[PDB]
């Protein structure tokens, strides 16, 4: 209440009742994870969208003030109407509203994904409302897309603007030079965002596997939305390709095959320092990360098939890959990296080989 006299001071007190109420909302079904990236235990909120989000996602929400205003569940003071909004909404409600019509092939980011993916996911959902109005999905849903992308020249390392065309009709991605310069079957394409490697926030790695040799192509768009549209157009094209190439296969079984992120990437010594990429069973090494082709490859089969990974030497740390034929020795700078690498190799070893993987092994 107040104080006695002319001063008549108002005293607020320690109640923090409104914060307290919002905190309880975190216990409700659907609110256990960040609405946007899935991180456990969200501690921020957008009070205009009625979602519970992680710290990182809240920073992205702050870039979009016309759509989202954010408060810390604990560290911020709340108004009643704001608490009431959260009470009548939440993450489940936001899924039905903003994630109403998300195509099954559309990439959903996780916490370790790059900023571009996480930001564009939040923007597509809330700002553009892409999954409320399916018209907005045309860029990646038409089965055809063309446009200019900045592509790294194969040996010379310059990124120059070249025309790309993705066509589901012909089942290919192609590009033209300054008849196409290259035509790449969707069967053989993978795409992975690699902003740190490429040194660009919008950097996308497209790989093309032909005749057991993988060609690395590095591209970017000036506009973050346009590059993410390309990414998801690629996924749409793979999905449609896989549905017809493998009918009888469920969409659920097909969706994790659309595009693959690398398990592990980094410099190791082999003693020469090389950049390494672990793409499934396939350990490639390069002189430079942005080389078009691997210097060499090491195949990692199963335990069954005569493959083992070992610590130590028979850089400080050591890893040994024992293949049926030869032994492979690698040096890791640190023990964190050594652990992560070994974990990656162990994942290959612990899994039974497929007929196609035997075909790959035969080559190596």
């Amino acid at each position: 209440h107040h104080s006695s006299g002319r001063e008549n001071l108002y005293f607020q007190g320690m109640a923090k009742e409104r914060r307290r109420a919002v905190l309880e909302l975190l216990q409700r079904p659907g609110n256990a994870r960040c609405a946007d990236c899935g991180a456990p235990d969200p501690d921020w909120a957008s009070y205009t969208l009625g979602v519970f989000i992680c710290l990182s996602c809240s920073g992205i929400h702050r870039n979009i003030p016309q759509v989202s205003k954010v408060k810390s569940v604990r560290l911020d003071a709340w108004e009643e109407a704001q608490v009431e909004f959260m009470a009548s909404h939440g993450n489940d409600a936001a899924r039905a509203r903003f994630e109403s019509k998300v195509p099954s092939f559309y990439y959903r980011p996780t916490p370790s994904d790059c900023q571009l993916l996480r930001e564009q996911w939040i923007r597509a959902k809330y700002e553009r409302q892409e999954f409320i109005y399916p018209e907005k999905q045309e860029p990646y849903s038409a089965g055809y897309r063309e446009g200019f992308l900045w592509k790294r020249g194969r040996d010379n390392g310059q990124f120059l603007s070249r025309k790309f065309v993705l066509t589901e009709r012909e089942g290919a991605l192609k590009y033209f030079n300054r008849e196409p310069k290259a035509v790449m079957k969707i069967e053989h394409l993978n795409a992975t965002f690699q902003p740190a490697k490429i040194g660009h926030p919008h950097g996308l790695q497209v790989t093309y596997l032909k005749d057991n040799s993988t060609r690395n192509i590095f591209i970017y768009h000036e506009d973050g939305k346009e590059i993410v549209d390309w990414f998801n157009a690629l996924r749409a094209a793979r999905f449609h390709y896989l549905q017809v190439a493998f009918p009888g296969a469920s969409d659920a079984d097909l969706v994790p095959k659309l595009s693959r992120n690398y398990l592990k990437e980094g410099y190791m010594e082999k003693f020469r320092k090389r950049w390494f990429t672990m793409d499934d069973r396939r350990l490639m090494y390069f002189k430079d990360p942005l080389d078009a082709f691997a210097r060499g490859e090491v195949f990692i089969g199963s335990k069954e098939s005569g493959y083992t990974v070992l610590h130590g030497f028979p850089w400080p740390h050591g890893i040994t890959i024992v293949t049926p034929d030869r032994k492979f020795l690698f040096a890791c700078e640190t023990e964190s990296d050594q652990r992560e690498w070994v974990a990656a190799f162990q994942k290959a070893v612990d899994r039974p080989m497929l007929p196609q993987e035997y075909a790959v092994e035969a080559h190596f």
Binding site: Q158, P195, G199, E222
Partner: protein, 98 residues
């Protein structure tokens, strides 16, 4: 000590290299040591300093579009050889240190 424009086409009459000074001002103004014009570049956009002890530091000006090795940067950051810088929309450079 120089910046390589990663978008310069060698087959065209295009400037590839900008040499850095000890204290290098980058932006669109006549006053800047490296004068870049284009979308998302300010009159005064960035600052590169080469320390007495060979150390290279990038300082973005406020409210600028600035990425180093693909992630945004809003305070002083140390550069190494081969680092990639994006200024504005498409001023895309690579760093050569001796």
């Amino acid at each position: 000590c120089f910046l390589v424009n990663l978008n310069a086409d060698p087959a065209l009459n295009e400037l590839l290299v900008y040499y850095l000074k000890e204290h290098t001002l980058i932006g669109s103004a006549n006053s800047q040591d490296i004068q870049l014009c284009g979308m998302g570049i300010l009159p005064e956009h960035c600052i590169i300093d080469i320390t007495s002890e060979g150390q290279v530091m990038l300082t973005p000006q406020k409210n600028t579009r600035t990425f180093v090795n693909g992630s945004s940067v809003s305070s002083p950051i140390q550069l190494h050889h081969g680092d990639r810088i994006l200024w504005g929309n498409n001023h895309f450079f690579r760093l050569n240190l001796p």
